[PDB]
Design a protein around this ligand. Structure first.
Ligand SMILES: CC[C@H](C)[C@H](NC(=O)[C@@H](NC(=O)[C@H](CSC/C=C(\C)CC/C=C(\C)CCC=C(C)C)NC(C)=O)C(C)C)C(=O)N[C@@H](CCSC)C(=O)O
Ligand SMILES: [Mg+2]
Ligand SMILES: [Zn+2]
Lengths: 401, 315
């Protein structure tokens, strides 16, 4: 275990004897993480990095039907809860009974707006975030029933209704603009084959304006580089085949700098704390940058590993992000939630599976039963689900209006 | 008549006489619900009634007061927020009182997206940015890194052209936490939108300032990223003195940022037809191995890629 090596203690923060809110909060975190790392030593057992699959499964399978009122704050993110859960079950190789799947399909039908797109619950106005989640969920299920839920003509209209003259998209009518919208739109439009020639005109250029002095990408031009927004920006460009619109090298240096030398996990922004959900948003950028640089015929690219410490990330997730009761989380001390379960699992999968053309190479830390189903770095749903959905929707012509 | 959702004497809407005329509309989750939330009685009561007034599109003062409750129950419900803005214009509500309201709820939920977007809509409507910089500074006093607060601050500044005192605000916050990357970002936002970095005196002032910050806190990555970000533009090799000046901190202020920075200056020298290419290449390749094997192993795959890439190019 890379994290448990003696020389690893040298990776502890060096505050230069100048404490500030930033160094103090970081130190508190490393302190808590170190206690977790050493728990084995102090208890005299052999470290067993085990992914609590059955614990995670009961939690997920149960959350898929009902949730406590603690979830009232997510009453407008119901298609997200479906996606997060269905995708977590998918990474854990757990199946979706044809009856559950049909129930999910019917629920999303209620969340779908007569104007295209999906709202965060039955009867809510449509928004791009739950539209992305609803579509990804229906693709994970992958039945004709599921695919048919989506009204493609109204979806294209909806996308057109959010499109801005500058290339950006609103998240919803009368709503805000940020890089998430470009990705939500490019993800649902591509999967469903509704991309018209002008739908994403200026979009690649707008996203390129979000890349700042740091190498990363901010929510809108001028903003601090952020891990969640950077994934959306790059993943959207990959879909649009315009990754070249970015300075891929400065982006590569920025994301690799986000992995925490001590904790092994990824931080969302420079000088902020480690967070398990960034195992996906940040580490997920490496496969995408691999694909892009390779498309440019980069000769120096690895043929077995992503450009981050796959081992250390798997260790942070396995040792520090699981809730014994099932479910995954931000960092030790945090409470579990379906969002973090989905992205901690999503990032683990990315950390375990490498691939580049004909090259395939796994790295599964701990017990071999830890290996998860692979995840598509652009859509974050199983690669099979991606091929299966796109091939299906390619049987339908792009809505002509 | 605002009966606080938290008032000890708060009464369910179904028990309120001034609402007895309207029938609450329950949520349609289907016969076989998935991800079904077991709502509290209060939540369920307010939303079933919100559904009622929304379905009938009742633009009343009572409906207006109710959206306030639905928002407090779930501030992320954007559908409620929409209807609330619909009622703000229909009923011709005082938008300044609404600014008071949005100020309160943002203080409570500063990381909520809806609350900030709403405040922006109000500022647009009123074409009044007079309270903004001060309000945002109060939020940043509680969390100097709040992303929405910084985003709103950038919008107000660019939109209403309030650039004059921002660099000063930046210096203040940098004093409080020189490691606050949001502030290093704001510094760049102000400068590039005002003087630019082409002005040699500005560039000189910025590089010098940054270098003094690196001297004080050598392991602070933000100052390192900023130094790189503002020079990387024209090319690091374009600044011959810089390699020397950092090569001098090699013993005193020698973090893995300085090492990485040297490999960065080398990469650009090699690309820009530098003297001693065989020599420079070796140093840069040496540093990549030291970094990969010893100094910055978490990034070993990256630094190796760099080494390989540097060879394939400048062999
Ligand atoms: C998937 C939801 C998305 C991340 C986002 N939600 C939030 O920001 C909520 N907060 C949290 O989830 C945090 C997680 S820990 C901090 C890290 C992040 C938030 C990652 C950022 C990633 C982004 C922005 C990319 C998202 C990609 C998309 C394709 C959408 N929890 C805590 C305890 O801090 C909110 C509570 C702020 C989001 O998009 N939220 C919208 C959409 C809701 S669907 C109608 C919102 O309105 O809140
Ligand atoms: Mg909104
Ligand atoms: Zn998180």
């Amino acid at each position: 275990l890379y994290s448990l090596r003696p020389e690893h203690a040298r990776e502890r923060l060096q505050d230069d004897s100048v404490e500030t809110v930033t160094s103090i909060e970081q130190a508190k975190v490393e302190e808590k993480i170190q206690e977790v790392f050493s728990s084995y030593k102090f208890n005299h057992l052999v470290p067993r990095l085990v992914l609590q699959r059955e614990k995670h499964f009961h939690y997920l399978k149960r959350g898929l039907r009902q949730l406590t009122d603690a979830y009232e704050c997510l009453d407008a993110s119901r298609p997200w809860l479906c996606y997060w859960i269905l995708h977590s079950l998918e990474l854990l190789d757990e199946p979706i009974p044809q009856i559950v799947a049909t129930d999910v399909c019917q629920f999303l039908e209620l969340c779908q707006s007569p104007d295209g797109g999906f709202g965060g619950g039955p009867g809510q106005y449509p928004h791009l975030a739950p539209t992305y989640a609803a579509v990804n969920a229906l693709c994970i299920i992958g039945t004709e029933e599921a695919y048919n839920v989506i009204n493609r003509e109204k979806l294209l209209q909806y996308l057109y209704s959010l499109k801005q003259p500058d290339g950006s998209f609103l998240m919803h009518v009368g709503g805000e603009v940020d890089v998430r919208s470009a990705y939500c739109a490019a993800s649902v439009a591509s999967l469903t084959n509704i991309i018209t020639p002008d739908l994403f005109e200026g979009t690649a250029e707008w996203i390129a304006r979000c890349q700042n002095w740091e190498g990363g990408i901010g929510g809108v031009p001028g903003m601090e580089a952020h891990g969640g927004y950077t994934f959306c920006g790059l993943a959207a460009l990959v879909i649009l085949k315009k990754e070249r619109s970015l300075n891929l090298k400065s982006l590569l240096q920025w994301v690799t700098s986000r992995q925490m030398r001590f904790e092994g996990g990824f931080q969302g922004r420079c000088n902020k704390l480690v967070d398990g959900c960034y195992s996906f948003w940040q580490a997920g950028l490496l496969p995408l940058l691999h694909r892009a640089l390779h498309a440019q015929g980069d000769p120096a690219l690895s043929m077995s590993h992503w450009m981050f410490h796959q081992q250390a990330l798997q260790e942070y997730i396995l040792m520090c992000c699981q809730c014994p009761a099932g479910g995954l989380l931000d960092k030790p001390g945090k409470s579990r939630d379906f969002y973090h379960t989905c992205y901690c699992l999503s990032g683990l999968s990315i950390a375990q599976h490498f691939g580049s053309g004909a090259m395939l190479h796994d790295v599964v830390m701990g017990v071999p039963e830890n290996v998860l189903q692979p995840t598509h770095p652009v859509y974050n749903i199983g690669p099979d689900k991606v091929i299966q959905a796109t091939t299906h929707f390619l049987q339908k012509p792009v809505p002509g209006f | 008549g605002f009966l606080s959702l938290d008032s000890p004497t708060y009464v369910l809407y179904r028990d309120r006489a001034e609402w007895a005329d309207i029938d609450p509309v329950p949520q349609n989750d289907g016969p076989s619900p998935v991800v079904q939330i077991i709502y509290s009685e209060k939540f369920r009561d307010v939303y079933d009634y919100f559904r009622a007034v929304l379905q009938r599109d009742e633009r009343s003062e009572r409906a207006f007061k109710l959206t306030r409750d639905a928002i407090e129950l779930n501030a992320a419900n954007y559908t409620v927020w929409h209807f609330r803005r619909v009622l703000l214009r229909s009923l011709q509500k005082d938008l300044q009182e609404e600014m008071n309201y949005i100020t309160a709820i943002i203080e409570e939920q500063p990381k909520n997206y809806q609350v900030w977007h709403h405040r922006r809509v109000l500022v647009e409507w009123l074409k009044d940015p007079s309270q903004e910089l001060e309000f945002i500074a109060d939020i940043l006093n509680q969390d100097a890194k709040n992303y929405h607060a910084w985003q709103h601050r950038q919008w107000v500044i660019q939109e209403f052209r309030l650039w004059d005192n921002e660099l000063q605000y930046v210096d203040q916050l940098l004093k409080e936490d020189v490691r606050n990357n949001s502030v290093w970002n704001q510094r760049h936002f102000v400068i590039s939108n005002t003087t630019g970095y082409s002005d040699r005196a500005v560039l000189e002032r910025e590089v010098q300032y940054t270098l003094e910050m690196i001297k004080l806190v050598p392991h602070n990555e933000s100052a390192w990223n900023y130094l790189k970000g503002i020079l990387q533009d024209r090319g690091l090799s374009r600044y011959p003195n810089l390699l020397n000046q950092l090569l001098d901190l090699q013993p005193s202020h020698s973090s893995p940022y300085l090492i990485a920075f040297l490999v960065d200056i080398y990469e650009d020298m090699l690309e820009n037809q530098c003297d001693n290419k065989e020599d420079i290449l070796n140093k840069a390749l040496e540093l990549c191995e030291i970094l990969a094997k010893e100094k910055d192993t978490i990034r070993k795959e990256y630094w190796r890629y760099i080494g390989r890439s540097l060879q394939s190019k400048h062999s």
